[PDB]
Amino acid sequence: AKRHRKVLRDNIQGITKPAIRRLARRGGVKRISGLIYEETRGVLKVFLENVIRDAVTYTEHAKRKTVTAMDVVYALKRQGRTLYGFGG
Amino acid sequence: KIPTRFSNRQNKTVNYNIDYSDDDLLESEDDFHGIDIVINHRLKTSLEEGKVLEKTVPDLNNCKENYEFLIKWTDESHLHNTWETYESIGQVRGLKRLDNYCKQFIIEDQQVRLDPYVTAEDIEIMDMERERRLDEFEEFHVPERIIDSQRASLEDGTSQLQYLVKWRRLNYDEATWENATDIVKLAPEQVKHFQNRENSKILPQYSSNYTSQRPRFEKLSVQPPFIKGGELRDFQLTGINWMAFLWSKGDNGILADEMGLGKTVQTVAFISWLIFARRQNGPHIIVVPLSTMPAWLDTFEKWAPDLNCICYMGNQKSRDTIREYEFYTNPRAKGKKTMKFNVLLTTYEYILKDRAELGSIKWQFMAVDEAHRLKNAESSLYESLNSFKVANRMLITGTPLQNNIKELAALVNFLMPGRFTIDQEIDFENQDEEQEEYIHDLHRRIQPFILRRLKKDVEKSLPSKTERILRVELSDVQTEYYKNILTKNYSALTAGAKGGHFSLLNIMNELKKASNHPYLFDNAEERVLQKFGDGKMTRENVLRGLIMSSGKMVLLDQLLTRLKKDGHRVLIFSQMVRMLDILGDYLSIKGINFQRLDGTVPSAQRRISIDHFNSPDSNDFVFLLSTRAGGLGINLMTADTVVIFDSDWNPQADLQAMARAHRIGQKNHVMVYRLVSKDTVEEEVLERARKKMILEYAIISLGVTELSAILKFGAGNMFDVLNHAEGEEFLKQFEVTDYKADIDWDDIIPEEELKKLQDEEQKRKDEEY
Amino acid sequence: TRKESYAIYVYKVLKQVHPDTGISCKAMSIMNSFVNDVFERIAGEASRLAHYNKRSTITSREIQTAVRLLLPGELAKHAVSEGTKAVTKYTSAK
Amino acid sequence: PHRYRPGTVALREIRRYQKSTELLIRKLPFQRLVREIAQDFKTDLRFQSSAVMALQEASEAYLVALFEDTNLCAIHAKRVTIMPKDIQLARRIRGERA
């Protein structure tokens, strides 16, 4: 069975355990339990669906198919998470 | 100067220095011989006790005292490899390397030896790759080049001569200091080559200073004495005379000969002529692809053994070793450093990686192999090589024009930056005399700068190659997928898919996927299995579903059966590796000894599969290929038939695809079958391919070493049938041969094949597994 | 295309406070975003202040009240000074 | 064999990554995750590169602040190891969870 699905669904596993460890090191965490990574993947996914849903709404209002950075800045500012350095 | 504005806010001062030191954290911090490579093992540790106890499996403790392992230690020279034992080692670094070696190698060795489910093919391929591993490790014992010699003081050993030795298949990072005695007792030819290179009579500092004062070149009808080699042919000497006459005029050039003619032999003979005859023994640079690198190294070692040809690959430490031990005659100095080498071989990756360490070298000649990679002016290799201070450049390629005139404009701008300019394209809808005058002006402009020798003008033993274009209809599934994509039907394209994630970005790519096979799309095989084969999927209806799903490969099934009845081997080229997976599964359920090649296969398994296909006792019948992989360094001498399943946008890829079996000296007539879907999006792909062939026959083929007729042929539209037998010759292999299959559901899977499949299914059900 | 920005004004203010210090393009993008964000905050607060008082115009009193509301503490206290004399200097000229 | 005690390498990484400014998540896995999340809202979505970079920078900022509050929760519970309940408590007090 060489053939398989073209699309990939485990892209939340692409946020690897060393990446989450580096994020915790930047946050100042010395010791990390083994169940941290699944919870971090879940909260990152929830945050990303919120921001991406608002940015897709901003894109669809402008009758566009691409998602610009300015829509992402709008979506983050609407959630009280203003980001500097991408225009505006 | 002074700030004109200040802050009146009385905030406290803040030290913003984020730099830190871990010297306070040294309380738990810090304030070369060990096992490196295990090569071979022997079943007798000290002596053979007997042939008893040959059954069962041994554990790790049993294998600790029963086997001796060949060890190359850390920072050694692959000649002090010792047959050691676990109790003879003690506790050194890298012991767990030997633990992993012994453990898992003995586990799958005894597993494949004790398994009754082992075929002969698996044991012979693993034995053959084991032998390849064994003599690949044994090749490291042979030295290849001596870099430097020194006098070193050992432990009360007075003064000893010590050589820097490089080995055969390894790099300069592992080059070792070794004794002189075993080196001169092993291979004294490399030693005397080293003393010849030490007080050599040819240096870059002794080169001539020809500044637009080069002498005239007389034609040579005899092989020069300083190029020993083997035998140099007449067309090679003609190319030598052409390159020498181009260098005498101070002009750059393109050696546009076909592959297989020995362009490497021609350019090594030209480099030897420049070094020896014209006394231009200065620093030369040759940029080659990585896959063709040993084919240039052995040519330098054979044809011009007196040259100081050096190699440039490796990591940062190997390139540092080459840079600081071998570039300069006097690297210990601080002023101007003269060059010690003569020719430097490198690849594109280390041209871009080491622009700064190579651009400050007064090169005398540049030779760039496979110049079509340099076809883009905006690619980073173009600005990397165009910034080099080189007086004379030369481009070696097989396809000078690939898609348009702009590629040739980029090549002639890299060669002569300013003399040649091109500002107009070619329009087939114009058909005016000004375009023909422009074509003739381009013919008369780059005529002495292009030397192209065909495979038919020289070596008059090549069998002809015939390309047949086969246009086949579509299935009902292919037609409904084509109308669903073209008239976008996301609700209908979802249908029974649970995910429902259909991406219609790049519409034409999805149209090509629908024209190739419906099973490339996700959740598409289940509808065919539940609509025609009623969802049982019991080892027989799945092959029939593969047959009826794609309208292309029923003709491929008929062709493979017809060429199975004949004594020929077939290559199948494709653009997508998922379609190659579809054919691999089709041959797996079909049960045909097949081999596969794509980009995911590493080069060792590539070499394994090529040697398995090219053996005289090969049981392989069909070889699947991805079209744009491997370059020109793949030989398919045993192949006879080439089937282009998917056409390429650049037809030079198709020519190099069908040139894998159509090499020099082929003993059979090469037949090419192209599988094209009727009334689909591939027709304009074939139209653009035929337009590029018309452009290639116009500019390149008529200016080697009736224009309106081929212009009108390119302006038009191109839109006993599988027999393996066969100006106006250029018009051939362009007609479209329509094929009528009319194969229904019950015609495929005949009685003998279905009976064999049912017997195999019953044998698998009886034996379980 | 003429795309307006606060680039040259931020650069000349930088040359006032640090005459020998350069700046990168990403830092200029961040400074432009900061100026636009603070302008939007102060203008929105002044618009709300004019709306709550049933006034149809935005004056310097509304901007002063918005600066006192938004800017925290002593950052307001100097800025309320820094605006006021500028307005006074404008009154000395126009 | 030279070894370090468990914790000084962690302090060295904390000092290293609080000095640096680059993103700590690789580009292609984050881009694939963004495209997978976005295709559940609208099919056939294109993406600018700067949009993916802005989404990334927002994501590491949110996760670094969340890990800071998680470390405060773990220290308050007389621990040096962070637990999923510390993340849950941080998101509960912050107001994102409940």
D33-64 burial: b if 16+ Cβ within 10 Å, else e: bbbbbbbebebebebbebbbbbbbbbbbebbb
Cα angle at B761 between B756 and B763, to 5 degrees? 95
Q: Give C-chain residues touching A88 at CB under 8 angstroms.
A: 33, 36-37
Contact A2 B501 (CB under 8 A): no
The dihedral region occupied by B178, where left means phi > 0, alpha psi between -120 and 50, and beta the remainder, is: beta
CATH number at residue A16: 1.10.20.10
CA distance to partner chain D, nearest, from residue A55 (Å): 9
State whether residue D47 is helix, strand or coil. strand
CB atoms within 10 A of CB B468: 16
Number of domains in chain A: 1
Q: Which residues pair with A88 in a beta bridge?
A: none
Written as one letter, the residue type at A51 is: V
Contact B503 D39 (CB under 8 A): yes
- Give the residue from B583, B591, B578 showing the smallest Cα distance to B556: B583
Would an 8 Å CB–CB cutoff place D9 in contact with chain A?
Answer: no
Q: Which domain holds residue A6?
A: 1-88
Sign of torsion over alpha carbons B52, B58, B64, B68: positive
CA distance to partner chain D, nearest, from residue B481 (Å): 18
B576-603 burial: b if 16+ Cβ within 10 Å, else e: bbbbbbbbbbbbeebeeebbbbbeebee
Six-digit token pair at B703? 């200016």
Binding positions of B: 257-264
Rg of chain C taking only CA atoms, in angstroms: 16
Per the listing, tokens 């060990």 go with B34
Q: How many CA atoms lie within 13 A of B152 on its CB side?
A: 13
- Residue among A3, A6, A7 whose CB faces B582 most closely: A3
Chains that touch C (3 or more CB pairs under 8 A): A, B
* Nearest residue of chain D to residue B491 (CA atoms): D43
Whether A11 contacts D60, CB under 8 Å: no
State whether residue B145 is helix, strand or coil. strand
Written as one letter, the residue type at B523 is: N
- Give the residue from B289, D58, B255 showing the smallest Cα distance to A75: D58
Contact C20 B2 (CB under 8 A): no
Six-digit token pair at B468? 């047949």
- Give the residue from C57, D80, B197, B699 showing the smallest Cα distance to A28: D80
B637 phi, psi to nearest 5 deg? -60, -40
- 3-42 in chain B: CB under 8 A from chain C: 3-6, 8-9
State whether residue B129 is helix, strand or coil. helix
Chains that touch D (3 or more CB pairs under 8 A): A, B
Whether B636 contacts B663, CB under 8 Å: yes
B177-214 burial: b if 16+ Cβ within 10 Å, else e: ebbeeebeeeeeebbebbeebeeeebbbeebeebeeee
Would an 8 Å CB–CB cutoff place C20 in contact with chain B?
Answer: yes
Whether A86 contacts D50, CB under 8 Å: yes
Contact D82 A43 (CB under 8 A): no
Contact A14 D28 (CB under 8 A): yes
- Residue among B503, B522, B585 whose CB faces A5 most closely: B522
* Nearest residue of chain D to residue A24 (CA atoms): D67
Per the listing, tokens 């034609």 go with B219
Interacting residues of B457 by C-beta distance below 8 A, sequence separation 6+: none
Would an 8 Å CB–CB cutoff place C19 in contact with chain B?
Answer: yes
Binding positions of B for ATP: 257-264
Which stretches of B249-344 are DSSP H helices? 263-276, 293-303, 316-325
